Design a binder for this molecule. Structure first.
Ligand SMILES: COC(=O)C[C@](O)(CCCC(C)(C)O)C(=O)O[C@@H]1C(OC)=C[C@]23CCCN2CCc2cc4c(cc2[C@H]13)OCO4
Ligand SMILES: [Cl-]
Ligand SMILES: [Cl-]
Ligand SMILES: [Cl-]
Ligand SMILES: [Cl-]
Ligand SMILES: [K+]
Ligand SMILES: [Mg+2]
Ligand SMILES: [Mg+2]
Ligand SMILES: [Mg+2]
Ligand SMILES: [Mg+2]
Ligand SMILES: [Mg+2]
Ligand SMILES: [Mg+2]
Ligand SMILES: [Mg+2]
Ligand SMILES: [Mg+2]
Ligand SMILES: [Mg+2]
Ligand SMILES: [Mg+2]
Ligand SMILES: [Mg+2]
Ligand SMILES: [Mg+2]
Ligand SMILES: [Mg+2]
Ligand SMILES: [Mg+2]
Ligand SMILES: [Mg+2]
Ligand SMILES: [Mg+2]
Ligand SMILES: [Mg+2]
Ligand SMILES: [Mg+2]
Ligand SMILES: [Mg+2]
Ligand SMILES: [Mg+2]
Ligand SMILES: [Mg+2]
Ligand SMILES: [Mg+2]
Ligand SMILES: [Mg+2]
Ligand SMILES: [Mg+2]
Ligand SMILES: [Mg+2]
Ligand SMILES: [Mg+2]
Ligand SMILES: [Mg+2]
Ligand SMILES: [Mg+2]
Ligand SMILES: [Mg+2]
Ligand SMILES: [Mg+2]
Ligand SMILES: [Mg+2]
Ligand SMILES: [Mg+2]
Ligand SMILES: [Mg+2]
Ligand SMILES: [Mg+2]
Ligand SMILES: [Mg+2]
Ligand SMILES: [Mg+2]
Ligand SMILES: [Mg+2]
Ligand SMILES: [Mg+2]
Ligand SMILES: [Mg+2]
Ligand SMILES: [Mg+2]
Ligand SMILES: [Mg+2]
Ligand SMILES: [Mg+2]
Ligand SMILES: [Mg+2]
Ligand SMILES: [Mg+2]
Ligand SMILES: [Mg+2]
Ligand SMILES: [Mg+2]
Ligand SMILES: [Mg+2]
Ligand SMILES: [Mg+2]
Ligand SMILES: [Mg+2]
Ligand SMILES: [Mg+2]
Ligand SMILES: [Mg+2]
Ligand code: NA
Ligand code: NA
Ligand code: NA
Ligand code: NA
Ligand code: NA
Ligand code: NA
Ligand code: NA
Ligand code: NA
Ligand code: NA
Ligand code: NA
Ligand code: NA
Ligand code: NA
Ligand code: NA
Ligand code: NA
Ligand code: NA
Ligand code: NA
Ligand code: NA
Ligand code: NA
Ligand code: NA
Ligand code: NA
Ligand code: NA
Ligand code: NA
Ligand code: NA
Ligand SMILES: [Sr+2]
Ligand SMILES: [Sr+2]
Ligand SMILES: [Sr+2]
Ligand SMILES: [Sr+2]
Ligand SMILES: [Sr+2]
Ligand SMILES: [Sr+2]
Ligand SMILES: [Sr+2]
Ligand SMILES: [Sr+2]
Ligand SMILES: [Sr+2]
Ligand SMILES: [Sr+2]
Ligand SMILES: [Sr+2]
Ligand SMILES: [Sr+2]
Ligand SMILES: [Sr+2]
Ligand SMILES: [Sr+2]
Ligand SMILES: [Sr+2]
Ligand SMILES: [Sr+2]
Ligand SMILES: [Sr+2]
Ligand SMILES: [Sr+2]
Ligand SMILES: [Sr+2]
Ligand SMILES: [Sr+2]
Ligand SMILES: [Sr+2]
Ligand SMILES: [Sr+2]
Ligand SMILES: [Sr+2]
Ligand SMILES: [Sr+2]
Ligand SMILES: [Sr+2]
Ligand SMILES: [Sr+2]
Ligand SMILES: [Sr+2]
Ligand SMILES: [Sr+2]
Ligand SMILES: [Sr+2]
Ligand SMILES: [Sr+2]
Ligand SMILES: [Sr+2]
Ligand SMILES: [Sr+2]
Ligand SMILES: [Sr+2]
Ligand SMILES: [Sr+2]
Ligand SMILES: [Sr+2]
Ligand SMILES: [Sr+2]
Ligand SMILES: [Sr+2]
Ligand SMILES: [Sr+2]
Ligand SMILES: [Sr+2]
Ligand SMILES: [Sr+2]
Ligand SMILES: [Sr+2]
Ligand SMILES: [Sr+2]
Ligand SMILES: [Sr+2]
Ligand SMILES: [Sr+2]
Ligand SMILES: [Sr+2]
Ligand SMILES: [Sr+2]
Ligand SMILES: [Sr+2]
Ligand SMILES: [Sr+2]
Ligand SMILES: [Sr+2]
Ligand SMILES: [Sr+2]
Ligand SMILES: [Sr+2]
Ligand SMILES: [Sr+2]
Ligand SMILES: [Sr+2]
Length: 237
RNA sequence: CUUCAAGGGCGGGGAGCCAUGUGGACACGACCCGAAUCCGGACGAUCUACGCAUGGACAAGAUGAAGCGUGCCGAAAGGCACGUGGAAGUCUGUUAGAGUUGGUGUCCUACAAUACCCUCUCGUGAUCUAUGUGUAGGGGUGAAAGGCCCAUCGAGUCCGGCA
RNA sequence: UUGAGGCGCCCAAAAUGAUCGGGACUCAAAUCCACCACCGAGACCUGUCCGUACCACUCAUACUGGUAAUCGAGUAGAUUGGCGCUCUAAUUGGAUGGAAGCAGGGGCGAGAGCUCCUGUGGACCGAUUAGUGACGAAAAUCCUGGCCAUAGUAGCAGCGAUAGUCGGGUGAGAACCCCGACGGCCUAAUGGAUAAGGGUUCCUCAGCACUGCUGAUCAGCUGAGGGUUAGCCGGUCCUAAGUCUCACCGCAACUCGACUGAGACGAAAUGGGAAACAGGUUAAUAUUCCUGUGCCAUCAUGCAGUGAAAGUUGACGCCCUGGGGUCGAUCACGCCGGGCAUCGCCCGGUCGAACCGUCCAACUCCGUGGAAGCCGUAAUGGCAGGAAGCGGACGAACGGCGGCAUAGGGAAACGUGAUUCAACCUGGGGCCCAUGAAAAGACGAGCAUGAUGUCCGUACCGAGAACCGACACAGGUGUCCAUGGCGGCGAAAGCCAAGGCCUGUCGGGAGCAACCAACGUUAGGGAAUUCGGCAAGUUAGUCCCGUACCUUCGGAAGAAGGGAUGCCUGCUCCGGAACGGAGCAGGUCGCAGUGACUCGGAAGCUCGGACUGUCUAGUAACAACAUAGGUGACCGCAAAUCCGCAAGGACUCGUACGGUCACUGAAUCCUGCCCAGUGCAGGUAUCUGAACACCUCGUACAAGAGGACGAAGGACCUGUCAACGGCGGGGGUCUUAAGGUAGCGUAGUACCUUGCCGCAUCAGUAGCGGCUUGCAUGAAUGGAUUAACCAGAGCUUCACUGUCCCAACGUUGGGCCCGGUGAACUGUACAUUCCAGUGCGGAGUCUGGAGACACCCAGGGGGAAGCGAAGACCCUAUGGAGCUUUACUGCAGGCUGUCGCUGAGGACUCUCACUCCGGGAGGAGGACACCGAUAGCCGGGCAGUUUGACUGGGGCGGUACGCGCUCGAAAAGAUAUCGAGCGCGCCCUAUGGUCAUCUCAGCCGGGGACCCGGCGAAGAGUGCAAGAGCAAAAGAUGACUUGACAGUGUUCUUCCCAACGAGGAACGCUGACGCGAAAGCGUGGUCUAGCGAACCAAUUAGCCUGCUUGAUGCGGGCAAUUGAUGACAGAAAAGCUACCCUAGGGAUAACAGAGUCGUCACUCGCAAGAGCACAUAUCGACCGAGUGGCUUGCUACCUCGAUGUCGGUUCCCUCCAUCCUGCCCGUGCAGAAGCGGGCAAGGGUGAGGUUGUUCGCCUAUUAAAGGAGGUCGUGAGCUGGGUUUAGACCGUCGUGAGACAGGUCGGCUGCUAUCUACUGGGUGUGUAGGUGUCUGACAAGAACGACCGUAUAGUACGAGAGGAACUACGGUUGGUGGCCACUGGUGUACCGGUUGUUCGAGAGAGCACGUGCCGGGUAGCCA
């Protein structure tokens, strides 16, 4: 047959690539040595084309104009502090050890000094729970208990732009516009609507899948379609 | 040679070797032409598909969302009337432009290897379009028709394998 | 009276024209019995010759003689002698006193071929012998070239751009080259400027051989010259998506490859960007040259300045909108010029840049001020955190103003104000799950003078002739002019300027016929047409009134329906005003006032998909795809998913409100039961589970055998269906888990089926509602439902109409004739055919007849199974390809163990490799992971293949695919079919072998066990089919025994004849045995079925052998046994294709023809039976005999290098088995009306509703509304609804691709007529200069068919009811021929009205598609 759509994806052609040249900033945490004497004023609130949520333009004490991942309730004029001895206020970045338990946090690092990996999408947050000399247990937006190094930096507050998922797209045109700003080929043609040559579920006199949809983990690319290694399917039971 | 034995098999009382012509066999293109393949290396996104960059295009009219206003009523929440406002993959539209339903009309050694006419659809948007740019052959591209990738596609084209 | 024979008669119906081959024949030219004489082959006889064979003579196969009654045809094929071509060689010749070749002619040879003569030609050419070979053509849809017919034919018409005409000029020549006039065409283009692309096409001169749809003096053609001028227009410079180079790394390697660095490249209309304007000039350039004026950058000098880099700019989305404002357009008035001349109106002009200077609205801000309700807007809005007002800072135009300018330009005047205002300037608002470039550069940052400003592009076209499309192609191809006038909402129509053009480039002629393309108008009827209103038409602009069901409250909706609409006079209202808008009163014209143009037909029910959107470039626009919405799955990021061999990469400037992978498909109400199978996932005592290492055996080592341990995986258990899917049969459970819940339901799913009832219609296989047992509905394989939307499928109503009844007339372009230009398709030959026949069964050519003087013109297409295409259907090939899967075999990939990297102290700690994070310090992880290697599991993701044969085509079924018997089988042997009957793939240690003893079925008689006797050739028994064999046995009993033995043959069979293996049998020998007294019997079972190659393994006994040699291990071999290939003389092996492809086949199916005639239709014989009695008025069984060739079936003869499929239509002919009509017979015939039958094919046999239908059902009419044949007549006539391509849906089936003799929506119709045929028209020839009139052999007709009514007559008849006829009349209908006084149509003759626009008004005209529209309409032509 012919390579399926998921295989054409990896080749990284124009149709599948993100419009990186139209993107603003790689929202990472600032590099401080030790001292905390790094603070800044918020100059503007901009729209980030990569995440459909707002991003705050901050100017630091040493004269560095950088775009930071904006939490909720951060405006122009507000002072934000980045460092170890930083104030426990919304919009400030300090390591998980210094942040008190039961406080909603965002833009959490995986390995200390990476710049933030977890809890970055609109309105989400990570919950800091347990403290130790060795480990800081953070509850990620999926409900998972992630055991992290207490030296991993994070910004206090929930991410801005909450409730985005609440309003429906209503029409295909609105989806079109959102998708033109992402690294995704859209619209989606069902495999069941294709020819046998194009997809494992293609073919037939009527539209139905060939074999069952739940595919093994060990399945090769070109066959791994439908429900990938499903523990279960359906709603009931 | 096989063989207690017996019986079988093959060979035996000197004709061959070489040359030339010719009959026939086998491998090779194998009397000659005749077809759909398969494989290799190359050349194509001047057509077309999808994406991207930078530009361009859309007479006129209709309908009248929110919001705002004034007035009346109400304790209030609000409600009603009128106006304002000018939303919309909104409507009419041969505006430009795009498309192509029917005539199974005209043409069918054509004007034309996909044309002509009338009719018909869309026309502020998932819109149309120029140029630049990207993706390449079991690979692209595909709102999926096995569509499209230069009159070539259920695996392009060229040459080679190859007689 | 009865029997028999001969010939004939009845029985006896078919489609273009009858037949014995024809004519025709009757005491025969028939038939039968005899007879006589003839004709008639290549046979037979005979003369001569030839070949071949043999004989004699001979060296001879050279002569000569002889023999053939017992030699003389031949495809495939075998054998043999010879002819011709090229060049070589030897020998030997010819030729300028004329070689070869060619043309015509003479002679020889059976022939291949040889040779001569004459003419031409003008330099080479032979013979014999031996060689050599790119050596012989009628053919291959053969190749290349040339050429004829086709043919003076098609095209040079068709397009909303119908274009020309009269004079004249030039010239050898003029319809189309030029001038004028008149008449037209183009208005987002047919005008103006350009991008690409072209490349000299540009200008001039000279030309016409080429090219130009005719011609040409012209030209984009031919030839020669000439032509493109830049500091300030582009390029150049900058950076965009992105590209390349180098370095690095990978790769076997590179011209290959991702990342990361650095560098460069990447924008000519249309991104950014230092600077130019006005005029003049050329045959051709021009912001480039020239004149005038101006501007920018750099550098130099001088003055100023020490500021200098922060900041600003470059620099930005979509929608709405205010303000400023120029060109343009228009209005007012004035000046200059022109036009018109009943008025006094109409047109043109009235100019003047860059630049320099200056002005500033908006925005923002400052001071003042002090609003508690005011300020403000088109709108939002603003404010004690300070509103209005006042003053001020900053600050715009491509704009105003002044200079520029006693510059330029104009014949002249050489204006002034205004409105609406593109450009340009500047603000306010709204939207985003969408956030709308970058860099160079500039500003910031003065002035003078001077210098420098190079390089590249620059012509022309930019398209119905300069580009792409082979073309001077009706196609395709980007940008700017979007503000010219009237018109109107308008960048709409229509008309007209500026500008362009008569080159969408052949003309002339005929009231100009048929026929065709586009089109106008048609009385009465009004969808009767058709699958279907396809096509056409209707409606229409604007205002007022008014507006249903339903609904998601948005909508439906312009629902529907009704009214109005012009001009003129005078006005009112809104607004600053418009040359803006809304109204009022009076007057007034037409058939018509959106007067043309522009411009919706409307309503209802049902199906589908929610909607906008997408798609098969080129037969599918749809119900298919997408969509929001719903849902499930995977993943915490060193992730999930995906790309790469690797180095590496996408997702990702991303992080679960994410994004990957799938399903469903808006909303609303909902979404039942099932985890048995399959899938996925989790778990797992126990079981199974590879390699490494480890242990045992083995080997001085090794191979090898075994054990222990045991990962993932599997077994097993569990979870899961919005996972694949399933939701039945039986009874008052069974399979296999459950057993169909809401709903919906004859469905796009229902076979039966046109289901039943209802609605609607005269009539409704349709449609809608209800019912509904559902062949075979049903819940995200989503069920139901649904407002809105739709070039989607079906149905109904109103309106409308040439779709129809039923056709007519007209208009334009063709067609026809003439000048010019000038193809192609097609061609074995012959060809004037027709009716029959025959033939490979579908003949212009054969046979028999008939007809036929030749040639030409026009026509519509009957035939040439017409032309076009090596059939796409079907089968076949040990063909191809795409696709599928639990086909065969493999390959990636994932998971998992093990080894290496890899280190220290059956679980654990550490840090030093290694990995990751961190800029770094350092942090996390860590001997793991990554990577290299190997092992097990999964593994259509990918690759290569296979998937047999037989067969009344193929498939399905079956196996006549290996064996045995009877019959078929025709009395030797052999013998086929999917022939008839039926078996074998073993079984038996005795059921084998021998010997002894003995005789069985069945029956009878005496005491179904047992006993005695008798009869009893065989019917018993003998393992199993069938046929056969057997009685002191081959059977039974008993006893003994293992010959069912080893070895090796002969022969037959397998395979008749007649080659072929395994297998089998008969018959021997050698050895050893058993039994018997012995002869003898035993090579399994009485005979014929019970069977298997090579390779490899195991096994039996002895021996041979392994690379210098000895020992040991382990191998190689001779002989044979066992293990299976049943497709049985042996491959290891599944499907789909409608996406298809190739080779072929009429070796083979579908349609049609042909044969047959069971079937079908029709008839006949007999006549049981009933018909109150009565066979025969009428009906009529059984049985028997036939005819036809409409149905069906059978066959496989014809065609697969194609004979176009159903139904319908249109037009022609025919048959009779007659439905009506005419004439008859019978009657259970009173009459009337019927029933049945006979002759008879002249004429007729019609309109409609459902359905694609044929068929059929139904309605109303009718004299009747018959059937059938003509390739199921008729696609070079039509239609295209059905069948039967490619798209899609539903049901059923399938794991799946996909399938269906199921349903459903969509889905293409080629060609210029050579021959023949006919309809009409001519020219010639024959009869044999003329005019006029006739004759009539033949030929055609349907020229007529039928009905109603009145008188007869309320009569005959009949109780009555009821109710005729002859005849004479009147009319109607169908058909036919002709004609136009009458009625009607047309009438782009003509006359009138009138809308828009242009010619100034008037008058009078053009255009609005070949009449703008409306009204009337003569002649003619018509019904
Ligand atoms: C299955 O039906 C078809 O395949 C029709 C067609 O394909 C038509 C071809 C038309 C062309 C292309 C030749 O013009 C065809 O070749 O038909 C053959 C054909 O083509 C010449 C003619 C045949 C041959 C016998 C006569 N018959 C007439 C037409 C026909 C009709 C059929 C038929 C076969 C024939 C053949 O099956 C049933 O319907
Ligand atoms: Cl999304
Ligand atoms: Cl001879
Ligand atoms: Cl230029
Ligand atoms: Cl404003
Ligand atoms: K055929
Ligand atoms: Mg970031
Ligand atoms: Mg995109
Ligand atoms: Mg989809
Ligand atoms: Mg499909
Ligand atoms: Mg398909
Ligand atoms: Mg597949
Ligand atoms: Mg479906
Ligand atoms: Mg489905
Ligand atoms: Mg292109
Ligand atoms: Mg309003
Ligand atoms: Mg000689
Ligand atoms: Mg030759
Ligand atoms: Mg031949
Ligand atoms: Mg002709
Ligand atoms: Mg004209
Ligand atoms: Mg000239
Ligand atoms: Mg032309
Ligand atoms: Mg009429
Ligand atoms: Mg009809
Ligand atoms: Mg129509
Ligand atoms: Mg006023
Ligand atoms: Mg229906
Ligand atoms: Mg749709
Ligand atoms: Mg198409
Ligand atoms: Mg469509
Ligand atoms: Mg979805
Ligand atoms: Mg769908
Ligand atoms: Mg019904
Ligand atoms: Mg369910
Ligand atoms: Mg063929
Ligand atoms: Mg086929
Ligand atoms: Mg194949
Ligand atoms: Mg790293
Ligand atoms: Mg495969
Ligand atoms: Mg076969
Ligand atoms: Mg015999
Ligand atoms: Mg084998
Ligand atoms: Mg063995
Ligand atoms: Mg065999
Ligand atoms: Mg055999
Ligand atoms: Mg074929
Ligand atoms: Mg045949
Ligand atoms: Mg034909
Ligand atoms: Mg008769
Ligand atoms: Mg007749
Ligand atoms: Mg027919
Ligand atoms: Mg025909
Ligand atoms: Mg045809
Ligand atoms: Mg034709
Ligand atoms: Mg149909
Ligand atoms: Mg159909
Ligand atoms: Na092949
Ligand atoms: Na392209
Ligand atoms: Na409102
Ligand atoms: Na069209
Ligand atoms: Na549409
Ligand atoms: Na390919
Ligand atoms: Na022969
Ligand atoms: Na001309
Ligand atoms: Na100025
Ligand atoms: Na639309
Ligand atoms: Na199950
Ligand atoms: Na079902
Ligand atoms: Na008409
Ligand atoms: Na014809
Ligand atoms: Na294929
Ligand atoms: Na096979
Ligand atoms: Na034998
Ligand atoms: Na018969
Ligand atoms: Na027909
Ligand atoms: Na008759
Ligand atoms: Na036919
Ligand atoms: Na046709
Ligand atoms: Na037909
Ligand atoms: Sr980083
Ligand atoms: Sr990051
Ligand atoms: Sr499928
Ligand atoms: Sr459930
Ligand atoms: Sr391109
Ligand atoms: Sr508009
Ligand atoms: Sr619209
Ligand atoms: Sr059509
Ligand atoms: Sr035409
Ligand atoms: Sr065509
Ligand atoms: Sr038409
Ligand atoms: Sr529209
Ligand atoms: Sr080749
Ligand atoms: Sr002979
Ligand atoms: Sr002979
Ligand atoms: Sr030859
Ligand atoms: Sr010719
Ligand atoms: Sr013309
Ligand atoms: Sr131009
Ligand atoms: Sr000439
Ligand atoms: Sr010229
Ligand atoms: Sr450049
Ligand atoms: Sr530019
Ligand atoms: Sr204005
Ligand atoms: Sr054009
Ligand atoms: Sr076109
Ligand atoms: Sr003009
Ligand atoms: Sr011409
Ligand atoms: Sr008229
Ligand atoms: Sr109708
Ligand atoms: Sr009808
Ligand atoms: Sr009306
Ligand atoms: Sr729904
Ligand atoms: Sr299960
Ligand atoms: Sr039920
Ligand atoms: Sr003709
Ligand atoms: Sr073909
Ligand atoms: Sr058959
Ligand atoms: Sr025997
Ligand atoms: Sr199968
Ligand atoms: Sr299909
Ligand atoms: Sr008769
Ligand atoms: Sr009669
Ligand atoms: Sr029929
Ligand atoms: Sr029927
Ligand atoms: Sr007929
Ligand atoms: Sr049917
Ligand atoms: Sr069917
Ligand atoms: Sr059709
Ligand atoms: Sr004569
Ligand atoms: Sr009467
Ligand atoms: Sr009476
Ligand atoms: Sr006219």
């Amino acid at each position: 047959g012919r390579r399926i759509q998921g295989q054409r994806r990896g080749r990284g052609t124009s149709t599948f690539r993100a419009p990186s040249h139209r993107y603003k900033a790689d929202l990472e945490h600032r590099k401080v040595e030790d001292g905390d004497v790094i603070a800044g004023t918020v100059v503007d609130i901009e729209h980030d084309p990569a995440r459909s949520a707002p991003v705050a333009a901050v100017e630091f004490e040493d004269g560095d104009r950088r775009l930071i991942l904006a939490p909720e309730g951060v405006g122009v004029g507000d002072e934000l502090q980045v460092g170890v001895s930083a104030e426990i206020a919304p919009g400030n970045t300090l390591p998980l050890a210094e942040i008190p338990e039961g406080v909603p946090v965002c833009n959490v690092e995986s390995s200390p000094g990476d710049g933030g990996k977890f809890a970055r999408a609109s309105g989400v947050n990570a919950q800091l729970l347990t403290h130790d000399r060795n480990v800081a247990v953070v509850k990620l937006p999926s409900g998972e208990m992630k055991r992290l190094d207490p030296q991993c930096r994070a910004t206090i507050g929930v991410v801005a732009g909450g409730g985005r998922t609440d309003k429906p797209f209503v029409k295909a045109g609105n989806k079109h516009h959102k998708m033109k700003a992402r690294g995704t080929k859209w619209p989606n043609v069902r495999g069941v609507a294709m020819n046998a040559v194009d997809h494992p579920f293609g073919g037939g006199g009527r539209q139905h899948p060939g074999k069952p949809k739940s595919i093994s983990r060990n399945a090769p690319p070109g066959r791994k379609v439908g429900d990938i290694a499903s523990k279960r399917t359906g709603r009931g039971g």
